[model samples]
Target chain A: MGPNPMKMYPIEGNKSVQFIKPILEKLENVEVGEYSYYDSKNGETFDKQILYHYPILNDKLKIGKFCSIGPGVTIIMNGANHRMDGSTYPFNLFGNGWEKHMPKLDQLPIKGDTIIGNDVWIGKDVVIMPGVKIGDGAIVAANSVVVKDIAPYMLAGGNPANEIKQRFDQDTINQLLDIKWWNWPIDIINENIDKILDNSIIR
Target chain B: MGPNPMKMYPIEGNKSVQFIKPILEKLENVEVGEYSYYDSKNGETFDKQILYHYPILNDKLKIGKFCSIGPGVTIIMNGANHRMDGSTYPFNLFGNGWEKHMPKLDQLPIKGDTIIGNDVWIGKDVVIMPGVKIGDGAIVAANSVVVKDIAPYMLAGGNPANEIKQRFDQDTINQLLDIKWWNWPIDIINENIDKILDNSIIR
Candidate 1:
């Protein structure tokens, strides 16, 4: 009841980098935790660690450090407007001239925000928009759409987010940042829990 | 010269958006004149009239409106990947994960991302991935995937684009951003090009 999320498969994967490498290596030595809600309301960003339970709606989510947010995430800032005038031919054949509607939360249209970084790891049903950034130890796979701007240690996934590799170059990402091992402690992470769970590199 | 090409959508409605709004209103305000290699390896974000020229592999393109793209159209970022290392099962249940392989660059892993915004009108093969994100004055429907994030001026399509409304609100989006008319100039856009191509919302 504590590890072995199915022996954290190394060869039996559905999305197992060891069932999320010991919770993203114990969320890089914990700093922030809480789920289900948190909104800068479409602005304001600094400390990042988001782990699903999403629906910020606005404030272009800006996460960083030990991030692995998954589960039907939806960090939008503004979207949902269609109906292009008229002429429903197979539905106006999906027209586009711009003027749908959804502005009244004081008429929101705040473009550009969503900027995650530092030890990032967004996966599963990802859907970020409004000026996306995403850098630093990046790794957005599962259903990505981060618009654009992911570089540092990239390993991006489909739907607008390209890069695909480079999460340990530059000399193994500078020796995994001196083996931060998620900032140790916690009794050296429980005495190197079996070499941090079966031989590292997310075993 | 710096931005134009991106004026696709008009291929016979397979990607379908009702055949992409009469060719996006004959490429409204046409000035891009040329330059659409799938608008830069399909990064897809706009504010400069839209244009690219090369690389449209996946195929399913479509566009319209004062368009002027030339060169290639590698917008086809989609290929479809699955089998999340679980070592392949029913081909990952037939693309429930969209597959294509690219062990870094070996290539193969697209299933979304081919979205456009602002008075859109696509019609071609319209292949796009990297995890779609099309909003702001939207109008895809043509070989859509635009995966998720196609809101704003709505009118999506299949394969996960959903929605189909708006495209004329907030008082016509502030009267078309005060008829900025693409920052007009070119001789008052050739004498208002016959009232902006007969206005079917910037026809």
Candidate 2:
């Protein structure tokens, strides 16, 4: 009848707009753009390196503006790795003899910083690989495992996701990208919101 | 400082009732059979469209009993689409031109309702697409994008998930379906709880 102690995490400021949200214990390495949100949808994000005692790795997850991130979407960084070369068993990461056999940051292949572009809509349960860069206005279908870079205005889905189709013609996509409405001033965006939402002009 | 104003939606009554309980925002749109739950292991669900606006869309997401829905799973309805034949651009959706260019409910294809059968175990971050019917006792692996109907007792995983393996023989599956213990009275289920969990025979 008392509170469930097992359900609590070590983080705060995670207020869900709907159902229970994911427990974000750390947010220092993640740089989110304007009007972007990390929707937990009752999922889990295991950025455990931030809690580690010694600092040997420095990875980042950078996301762009006006993005609609869906539920249970995981943006895994380079820290969620193990020693894959030798025995593939992370012996040093676990118990006693860890200090002696600790591996160097350079020894492992860092997958670089994960980047997401503007006006993109990432679907639910999508796992973005480390260092994967998604272009502007790209739509990642639900449950996609994106292992590489996704181009602008392209609709990409599936595991190890491939380009399903381009949402628009090259010229239209170029024009839309040129507009870059996400970066426009708030007052201008509010003023011409009608034209922006209409298919009347690209402008 | 006050609570974040950006986090606000119209729907309510979404609270996680432990791991075995479903968060029903609008019970009418979703008919969860007895013992069924929408697991929110610290995740969120934004299903306001199903509960709001004029009653143009008569959609429903039904789930059978004893289903295990993992954290951050997104069950999107037919309401999540744009004009496919034309620009496929949801321009009107974003701003003031919405009333003019907004397509009629009939113009957009309703991909049918999403149905999940009894004793199904859907993994973390899984996105069940519109009209996807996962059969009884099906195990959807983590990060799988289920785009089609999954057969009974099948072990499926992947983006656009495929059948990995059958969990049991056809005879056993039929037997299990016939038993349908979830439909049994609470006292009977409680009496056989140990046997039920230990792979014992149906009484």
Candidate 3:
């Protein structure tokens, strides 16, 4: 795309856009969960923003419902990796014939799919490394680099994102999980939104 | 809006763009100071980025002159808060009865305006929390999470952004501040570009 090929689709007042790139369009494994807002429309900032590597790598991005993803957030997948077990320098990435000499997928350290749970809030410019799983209702503060698994309902921020605090007690977290408002029907959700969002009203 | 509406307006050498969004189009409180290039057009990365909390809350985003703001940067405003005193849970957010039970502006903890001083360089994917003030000539490294105030002429990086080093001594800092090359007329600035950017030119 030359310029401005991104299109915005609304989600509960917030909007997320898909950058029309050939690489993304060709991918069969890219998944953006429903009701989640992947903000790509602001200034078409998503235009030049890179997604997980493709073709040579085979991994997926699984985001959950009702999540709020801020702009310039990137998920780096296995395709971006080089054969670190060898020289660490990726000579194969430069050009032709290099692929034949490259290590097989089984021989490399292939981190699994990047998984994001329901109702997560990933802040702007945040990067989630390969094989990371963020639990439900977790908040990744702005510009944080997530290199490990985050517990549910934790407020995590910083490079290699450490836990700042637990957002709620285990009981409340269980209650939230049991409720799973993200899966509720839109009309039902609208009807009980206050109670649903109210911290004191947890089941 | 259709594709390619993000227009790049050149200031000095860097460029910033204005997305053709109704919400952004109506803002008067968003103040980007003179000669400050908010790099929105680098692939239209600024198109969907949220600036101020408009209408409901009235906090300004003031970026000073000659600042180099990298792409994919986000500034969250007062409107992005959840109630802190009651439970910090954001109920009523899913529509319907949110306004009736919602806390008034005064009841809320309003993080003040996000301020940046002259000639500051904020790296890509840096999320600046509300009420943060970055002093002049400070360099916020890429992917940093700035949650506090930074002193002038400092090099700050990493999560929760610590002061990595003082960019210069007090005298040199004062000299740089006194010079304020950013405020100089374009022709003079263009002519002295080398001397201005040179670290040894201070005092």
Candidate 4:
């Protein structure tokens, strides 16, 4: 009846918010850790929201466990990028025989893998740009366009998402990072749920 | 196949283009005309977009027939205005004897009522500023912040919206304005749809 990690649609009768791992098809590049969910606005699958994920390209979207993705969150892959060395117009796309002019993937500003660490909360309508890394325990505000890396335990937002503030002090963040509480077994996790929710740090 | 004026959701199976008239809960200052519709970005009601419109402002948002309102179009009203003769900061808001100096509605540099004329097509994510009058058949382009009046058949765009061009010459504009095609009965409109698309319809 409650939020269950095993259940794809955790909240019974509400298929809108679904755990990505169970619903996910085995894509060669994409990987989703357990308990990471996507709350779609219009009954769309989380996989559909990942734009321009061309198989030819080498980029991958990797997400860790315990992430809460809000409605209308768009994860743009490296395939959406255009060559910026000269003219933005993709002349090869119109191919009458322009296929020869097509630049190699290395020539373009193609970024690497897009990684979302554990316990991240991406707010509604946020656009995580190509190859961006959101560190563990980060909170991306609603309507933000993330173009850069967000450090662990920081709150970031805006068109080109900037760090608003750190969620905790350096020492506390270090301690939390050391704990790696999400890796613990569910049986053990239930016992420490109250302690985990509060400021009672695990020794 | 034909456009039905009575239909709330004109496009079949499309939940968008909700007729603002039928769904509206009789706000005293807001008046919408026949066949006027609002296409919400996130299924938000048109009433939710009309911000800062306090009932005491005595200003109205009067929209005429056959208007096409796009998604995320926001209509702001007089209540957003602050007294501009002196400091723009609202001192009366933090009442600790500052309430005594509260300015009358006239003291605030509030403009007149907002009026959108017949057959107007306002594009997506447009902000119609308080008390601005938009004449018949005007097209406020997408992502524009309309701060002033727009004349008939004019296409305006940008932050503080400027006229791009008039859709047609004065003669044709005058004839169309005089004809009031939107006022025609549903059967006549349906019959003349082809003629209306082209310039075959006689004035």
Q: What is the TM-score of chain A alone in each candidate?
A: 0.26, 0.77, 0.81, 0.94
- Sorting all predicted structures by DockQ, with the top scorer first, yields 3, 2, 4, 1
Query: Candidate 3, after superposition: displacement of residue A9 in Å?
Result: 3.4
Give the higher-DockQ candidate: 3 or 4.
Answer: 3
Local accuracy of candidate 2 as per-residue lDDT tens digits, B70-138: 776667777655444333434343323334556767767677778888889988877778878999889
1 or 2: which has the higher lDDT?
2
Better of 2 and 3 by lDDT: 3
Assess each model's interface with DockQ, reporting 2 decimals per model.
Answer: 0.02, 0.09, 0.12, 0.03
Which segments of candidate 2 are over 4 A away from where they belong? A1-29, A40-56, A94-98, A198-203, B1-56, B61-76, B79-110, B115-127, B133-144, B149-157, B163-203
Model 1 interface CAPRI class: incorrect
* TM-score of every candidate relative to the true structure: 0.30, 0.58, 0.64, 0.56
Clashes of 3: 12
**Local error of candidate 3 at residue B46 (angstroms):** 11
- CA lDDT of every candidate: 0.42, 0.65, 0.68, 0.77
Candidate 3 regions exceeding 4 Å error are A1-33, A42-50, A53-58, A89-99, A183-191, B1-50, B53-55, B61-76, B79-109, B117-127, B135-145, B166-203
Which regions in candidate 1 have their CA more than 4 angstroms from the true location? Answer: A1-61, A67-109, A115-120, A123-128, A131-141, A146-203, B1-38, B42-63, B67-138, B141-158, B170-203
Give the better candidate number (3 or 4) by lDDT.
4
Q: Local error of candidate 3 at A39, Å? A: 2.7
Give a tens-digit lDDT track for model 2, residues A1-203.
11111233312344332111122224566656654444455443333312222235677666776566666677777766666677766777776866677777877767777888877888766788877899988889876889999999899999889998997889878887888777876555555544544433474
lDDT of 4 by residue, B20-86 (tens): 7765547888888878999889878788888678888888889898889999988878775544332
The weakest ten consecutive residues by lDDT in model 2 chain B span: B2-11
Q: What value does the TM-score of chain B take for model 3? A: 0.80
What local lDDT does model 4 show for residue A97? 96
